[PDB]
Amino acid sequence: AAVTQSPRNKVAVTGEKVTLSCQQTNNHNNMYWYRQDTGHGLRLIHYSYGVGNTEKGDIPDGYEASRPSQEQFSLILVSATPSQSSVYFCASGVGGTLYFGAGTRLSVL
């Protein structure tokens, strides 16, 4: 897999800071973080057009993001809440191309 999510699973307690990391070997300019609730599609949280840039997606509230290097894009839940329990998916890409990670199941207790 050219896009790797770490951790693959996370169990958090309400209030804990959670960082989900996305690493790519695609050398793609863009990176993306999505949330997929059961029975819904992938909703865009934050994305990045390159190192040092983050842009708010459609559902940014409650998340921060970081693009510290060309190959890594992190999603940060500053203070986990039960409503943030979901499955999160990273993607790399350029133009219309999307290359997804395998997903991260997150349960906030």
CATH number where 104 lies: 2.60.40.10
Contact, 3 vs 90, CB < 8 A? Answer: yes
d(CA 48, CA 106): 22
Contact, 31 vs 44, CB < 8 A? Answer: no
Backbone angles phi, psi at 62, to 5 degrees: 95, -15
Q: Domain total for the chain?
A: 1
Nominal resolution (angstroms): 2.0
Query: What is residue 59's three-state secondary structure?
Result: coil
Output the CA torsion 6→10→12→17 (10° steps): 10
Domain housing 92 = 1-109
